[PDB]
Each structure stands twice: as C-alpha cells, then as structure tokens.
C-alpha cells in the first residue's frame, strides 16, 4: 500500500487543490491530504474550518483522508506512514521555493520522496490568496472553489 | 475614442510609473492612472495623498485622468468604460504574478483586454518599495521621483 | 488616434494561438499589420508563400488584419510600414529575458515605436510553433493547435 | 496499484543525476522503464546501441527497471507501454518552462498519462548530460558525474 | 588593501553566509560582515545577538571584523572605506531582487562594485526564514548553522 | 593580496557591455587577464586573431589588462595562468541557470578558482554579442554597442 501526503495550508481549499489531489488519488492508494495550522501565515479560516471544507470538497474520492496538523512537515508525513510528499507545480517562482522545502524534507526524512503535479491550465493562475483578494473585493470566485468552499468564503467575507 | 486604464497603489508614484503612463498616452485616447487604496498594503501615503501626488505629477500629460478606487479592479475598469488594463513589465518575477492577475481579470471582464508595456532601462530596477526604503534611511531618491512626490516623502518621512 | 500595429513572427505555421494574439490586436488597434519573416534563417518547414496564404486564411474573417511577408529587421519593416505598436505574444512559457532584450533593442533602433505584450487564452499558454512542429513531424496530434487550414497543409507537408 | 512509469531521454550517456532520478522512481513505482529515445536529431555521441548498454549496466542492481529504445514520441510509446506515469528529472538547474510546455502537451495527446517531477540529490542539480560531454570533450575531469562503465566508455569514445 | 563589506540581516547568520564570507576573505584583505538593524523585518534576534553569534561563528577568520549598522547601506559601506560589495547569490529569485539592490547601491555609490559569490551546493537551498520554520517546528537544523548560532537559536525558542 | 583575475569568452566580437565589465575587474584586482576562446565550434564572426587585436585595442587605456586567446576548457586555462578569481558578466538577459552549472562545474575542476558575478551598467544589461551581430548582420544600427574599432571592424566585415 503506497501512501502519499499532500500537504499544505488550503485556506481554503481551491479547484487547482481538488486537480493535484485527484491526480494524487489516481497514482497512489492512499492520500493523506495534510492542512498545516499556519499561524505565521494569519489564515481566513481556522484549522478546524479548513478541514471541514476539505474533507466536504474531496468525499467524492474515496482513498483522501483529511487530516489538520501543527507538526514539522516530515515528522507529520513519517506519523502517517508516508513515503510521497506531493505538492503542485504552476510556475517558476513556485519551483524555486518548493525545491528548498522539497530539500529540506529530505534532510529531515531521506525517506520521503518528494513528487511535483502539475494542475490542469485551468487552475494554472490561481492561489488561495489571489481568490482571497477577488473575494474581498466582492469579485465572483465561484468557477475557482468548490461549492461548499465558495459558500464558506461567501459567509466568512458577510 | 480608446480608454485605458493603468491601475496600481502608486504609493509613492515614482519616474517608472511617470514612463508607463507616458508611453501608455502616446498609444490611447484616454488613461485613467487609478489608484487602488490597498489597505492590505499598510501604504505609507492615504488615498486622498497618493491622488493628489498622481494628478500633480501627470498634470502635463492632457489625456491622463487621475481617479481613486477601493472596488474590484475588473469593475473599476467597467465602470470607467476601459478596453485596455496597462501594467508595466521590468523583471520575470513581475510576469508572473503580473500573468495571475490579468488572467483573473479576464475571467471578470473577457473585453478588458490587458496590455503589458516595458519601462526604460533607466527604472528597470526601481520600485516603490525600493525608493521608500532608501528614503527611510535618509539616502537620496531624488533622481526617482517627480518634484511634488520627491517633496512629499521627505516631509512625510520627516 | 488611428493606430497601426505590427505583429511579426515566422508563423512557420500559424498557429491558434498566433490566431488568439491577433485577435486581441485588431480589438485595439486600428489596422494589424500580421508580419511574416522571409527567415531562412532556421530552415522553415512551410516556405514564405505557403506561411502567407495560411495566415491569409486563417485571419480572413478579422477585417482589419493584412498579411504582409519581409525580410529586413523587424523594426526596418515597423518603420517603412508607419506603424507606432509592436505587438508581441507573451505565453506562460515565453523566454521573458529574450523578450526584454529584443524590445530594448527594438527600442534603441526605433523609440518611436512601441512593444506592447498581449498575454493568448491560457489554452494557448503553454504551446509554441516550434513544439508543435516537432509533436507533428513525430506523428503527434497537434489538430487542437492549429486552424484547419493549416492543418490540412500540416498533413500534406508531413506526407511528403 | 501496480503501477508503470516510463523514464525517458536521450541518456548521452547516463549520468550519476539519471541514476539518482531511476532510483527514486524504482521506490515509488512497481515497474519502471527506462526510455532511450533513438534521437539522431541532435547527433548523440553515443549510438542507440551504446546508450542501451551503459543504461542496462548502470542499473543493473535495479530489479524493477528495465531498459528500452523508443523511436516514437514519449506519448505514443508510453501508450503502448501501458505506462501512467511520465517520471521527469527536475534538476535546479532545469528549464521550467520547458517543462510545463512538455508537461501540457503530453497531458494532451495522453490524458491518462501523468507527469510526476522528481528532484534528484543537491549533488547532481547543477549537472546535465550536454554539460558533461563538453567538459569531456574539452578535457576536463567529469569521473566523479558517471558511473564507472559510463566514465570507462566515455574515454575510449574521446580517445578515438 | 581591498575592503570589502558582506551585509545582510543575519537573523541568524548560517552555514550558508559562513560559506560565503569565508569565499569573501580568501579574496580580499579584508571583510566586514556588516549586519543591518531591519526593524521592518522584525528579527528574531536582536542587532546585539546577531553581532555576538557572528563574532563567534566566524572567529576563525582572521582577516574578518563583525559590524552592525541601521545606516543606509551605501553611506555605511563609504564610511568603512569599503570598496566591494558582496552577496550570494543562490537561486534566480535571488538574482532579480539582487539586481535592483546592487543598481540601487551603484546610483548612491558608483565606487562601490557589487559582487555576488555562489555558495556551496549544500547551502543552496537554505535560508535563516527556512532554518527558524524549522526550528520552530522543532526540527533539526544542527547541520546548518555553526555550533553558537544553533545553541542561541534553540535557546531563543525555548 | 596579488590576485590574478580571469575573464573568458568569445568576444565575438568584444562590446560596450564587455568594456565594462573588465574595467569594474581592473578596479578591484591587481591583474585581469580577458580571456578570449578559439571556439570555432559555433563558427564565430570574426576569426580569433581578429577578435584579440580588437579587444586589445578597446582595453588598451586599461594597464592592468592582458589579452589572450586559449582553447582549452576555461578552468585548464586559469589554472596553468595562475589566475584564482573567473569573473563572469551578469546583465538583467543572463541565463542565471547556465551560470550556476556553468559556476559549479568550473568549482568541481578547480576548487581554488572563485566564480564572481559583476553587473554591468544598466546601459549594457539587455544586450548581448549574438543580439549585436544577429542586428547588425539584418542592417539594424549598433554603433551604440560597441568601441569605435570594432564598429569600424564589424562594418568592413558585414561589406564583404
Ligand atoms: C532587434 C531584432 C532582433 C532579432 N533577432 C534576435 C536575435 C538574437 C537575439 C538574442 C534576439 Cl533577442 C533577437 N530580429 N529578428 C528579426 C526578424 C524576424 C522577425 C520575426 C521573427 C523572426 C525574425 N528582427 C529582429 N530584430
Ligand atoms: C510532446 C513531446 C515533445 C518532444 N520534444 C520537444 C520539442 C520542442 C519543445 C519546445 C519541447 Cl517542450 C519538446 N518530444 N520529443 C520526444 C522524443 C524524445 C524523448 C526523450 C528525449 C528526447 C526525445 N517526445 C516528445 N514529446
Ligand atoms: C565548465 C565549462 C563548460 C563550458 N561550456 C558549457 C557547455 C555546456 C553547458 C550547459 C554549459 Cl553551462 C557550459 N566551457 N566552455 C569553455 C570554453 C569557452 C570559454 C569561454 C567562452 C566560450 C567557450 N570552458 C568551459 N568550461
């Protein structure tokens, strides 16, 4: 049984998510979709909240298990028995960043192969943030969340 | 009559944004140079500050109109009956986050089409934030900026 | 104001994002000068004629599109042709330092005319002319890239 | 899952970053296949034949990989290989763009097909096969980039 | 006798900055390790802390002087008579943010040469914001940063 | 410190852009040595005699500037001139990861030799040798790019 973790701080969780973790569900047998806390980052949406969203988002796919963590990364990813650390791949300024993290989980756990996916071009320029900021300006995200995530913004931005 | 619209924070306008706007009104009818307010930004001069200093600075420029915004920028641009969406390309890092944005302002309004003009080697290195931080540390940004902007920092930061 | 633009490339063949660029051009600007490089430079797969009757075709529909071969320097042609806007595609996967350096270039040999970058649909954003060229020379599917007109000349060319 | 990868690229010749990247993929994947393409379009100093060997030798401990010419695109072969995952090498060093074009392209002529980028060890994320043959080929010192029956084959090739 | 000044936040020095300073002296006569105050940055550790890890870190160098400034880069470097400027450069990211510093720096100080130095690829990938996300997960970065410099940061967030 | 400085490439031919960088290198090191390589392998403009008596002439006002040709790898070179400091050109038109291969595998072949980026003048950052000849050679303007003697030089060898 191959069990890859897909972590991140999802806040809150967008269609480009919902791409990589389902290409993740293809490739793996269980996928461990991993929402950081991420209190430096001052998150939208509690830890609670975010895996709430997530865990409503992905239920179609029947090999994700959503789980909220505050631990380091590789010391979360060794807990759960995974070998794959899955992370997405829209552009160069992404790569740059994710390879030092990618480097740094190696350090911390040789063990734990890190994987890049790469979104559909659909999801290719989005971020939580960029959709945060249209929201904020009450811009029409609906095409980019899925529907309980867009209700969720909607309610939190009231 | 074409009606483009060059949206930024502005804060302050340097002599790079002076050079979009300026190729910007020798390519369309009209510009409206819209200032975003960007609270989210914490920007060191208010709205009301960064219009006055805009209109002041392009006061020599006979199209250009000066306008204030704290809406969406697709709807802005709507409202302000604009076709064209101008931003200033200097790096790789710019394109990027430059290439999200106008995709998202696409997905809003397919009609704003978004135009990206190349400033002059003379600014390619420059940015608010950079002209700010010199200015923080008493160093001279004089040759940066417009005359009335230039002013304004020094009093500001005085 | 009654502008003209150039839109210059080898289009070796055109392909739908070319057709996505020029499209945007002629919305704002008044006449799109679609330029067609002589470029025997690279060795093209369609020939000058043959990339100038494609490009005929396929931009036929956009009333203020003219298709126009040159050989000179892009700016040489900008210049002789009167127009004052330069327009270059910017795809996803576009060599931006490449681009800086031709309209520094393109600026230093004539100011008066401008570079403006136009950005295609995202479905265009990640292809270029020559990656389809190669997917097509090795019995690749490129139909979804191209306007049938050039596809259909695709084909003849490869059966050859 | 039982899964099928497929490894491709022109290995002139397999370097220690190649090695890296087979190894990693053999612990995440039940079968791999490492791909040679035939690729005289960009005259390889090694034959088809020649890269086959080195390959099959330098991954011999590897009781999951199996070493394979293609002459097709990546796509059509990784079809008939019943392949779903596409193993690419991303080095620091890489051309991303590159990658993303190649990565949207073969997701569209094979939609069951995914790319999964890997990232080989710091010490070969600045290295590359073109790198390495002209530092060869201009005498300099590339023993500590190859496996040993690379490194013995490159010199006698360089010797002739 | 060629000066040349390394400055830089520091926050805290790493293995990676030890690597580059250490480049720094096989080739000049003499270096200053100069670290910037950064309020804006809101370092972990003090300017006081930062110099003191600094000293010790690199006392084995003996052509080496370890100075803090809030000054403008610039006026500081002509105040140390010096007359190079280093930097390391690790990734692209890097480079273009790089480049607007070091074009900053030449238009307050022609005199003084920029000049980037590559580390070591085991530092490559590292930075002081990674090694403290780490460490404030609890993760182990003994191998990055000198033996002082590890101490002090364990302690700091203990 | 003595220290002995390196500054290879084609210089084919030698630019404004050039001229900068070795004059910043003779202001912070004792000796420069521009280093000018017989790399025929992309059939070079002006041939290697042509290009050193240029670059002499356009550094000659430089006293601590020696010109010499070498074709051996750039490491071999510095290592038999003694030198311990590679000085390499970085304008905002570099290909940053070329550079970073290029930097790391000349500190595999010779651990004592430092890699130094120096920028040169805003004025030269979007330029390069193959943009200059690539203009010049489709009769674009260039005079700006270059010392007085390789304009004079470029033009006779363009007339021919
Ligand atoms: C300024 C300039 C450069 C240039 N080629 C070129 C060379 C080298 C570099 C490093 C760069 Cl950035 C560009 N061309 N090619 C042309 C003619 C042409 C037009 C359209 C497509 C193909 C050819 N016109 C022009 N004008
Ligand atoms: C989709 C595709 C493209 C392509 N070549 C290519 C062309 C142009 C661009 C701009 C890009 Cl991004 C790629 N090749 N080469 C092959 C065969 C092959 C496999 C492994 C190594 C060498 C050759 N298969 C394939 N499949
Ligand atoms: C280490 C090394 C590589 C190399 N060429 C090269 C090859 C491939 C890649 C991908 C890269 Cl990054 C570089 N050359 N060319 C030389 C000789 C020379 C000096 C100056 C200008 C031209 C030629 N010396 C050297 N040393």
Known sequence: ????????????????????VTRATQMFDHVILAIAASPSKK???????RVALAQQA????????????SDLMANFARNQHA???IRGLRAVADFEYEMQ?????????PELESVFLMPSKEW???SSSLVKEVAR??????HFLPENVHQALMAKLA
Chains 1, 2, 5 share one sequence.
């Open 43 to 49: 998150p939208m949406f509690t830890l609670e909240e």
């Open 137 to 142: 300006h009450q811009g029409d995200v609906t």
């Open 83 to 85: 070998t794959v650390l």
């Open 124 to 126: 290719s320029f989005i």
């Open 101 to 109: 993290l990618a480097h740094m989980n190696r350090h911390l756990m």
């Open 58 to 69: 992905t239920a179609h796919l029947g090999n994700v298990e959503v789980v909220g963590f």
């Open 1 to 20: 049984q191959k069990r890859a973790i897909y972590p991140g701080t999802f806040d809150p969780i967008t269609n480009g998510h919902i791409d990589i």
